[PDB]
Amino acid sequence: LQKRWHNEPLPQILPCVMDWIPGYDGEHAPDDAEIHYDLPVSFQPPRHLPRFVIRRELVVGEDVQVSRETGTSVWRPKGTRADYNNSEYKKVRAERL
């Protein structure tokens, strides 16, 4: 699970919605299985058929490891730097003089 900005919290229980699998032994679905109507046939005369869909859950960390955000920040104008001890400036000033 990929994280946004560092302060942002994360959901603790991630619901998964998955197709019911018979397995040819449990031929009858449980009573929690619900019908959705998104099995397509065509698109120009759009036609759909139902399917049995179940809903389970996952626990973050145990099941999905929290990924770390990429190297990024809110854009700030460059505040430059400052250094005279630097030898290159110590020689640039000699060239100027």
Binding site: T70, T72, S73, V74, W75, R76, P77
Partner: protein, 81 residues
């Protein structure tokens, strides 16, 4: 995703363009590998705002007139004028 908050050393447009540059730089360092180069053109009126000053040439071109950008995009897509 982080809302732009103004500071005294920038504008609303300047910070938005800078954050766009930062995101483009981060995604160029990531998914968009050497499989295929990505060609882009950046335009602001009379070079008002730069998108990623230097920054290993994040934008392939810097344009200061709408006609020049239109001509550049047309010349890439077909070479027509």
């Amino acid at each position: 995703v982080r809302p732009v908050s103004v500071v005294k050393e920038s504008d609303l447009v300047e910070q938005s363009i800078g954050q766009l540059s930062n995101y483009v730089n981060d995604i160029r360092l990531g998914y968009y590998d050497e499989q295929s180069p990505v060609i882009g053109f950046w335009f602001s009126p009379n070079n008002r705002y730069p998108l990623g000053y230097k920054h290993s040439k994040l934008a392939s071109r810097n344009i200061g007139n709408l006609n020049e950008l239109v001509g550049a995009v047309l010349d890439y897509i077909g070479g027509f004028k």
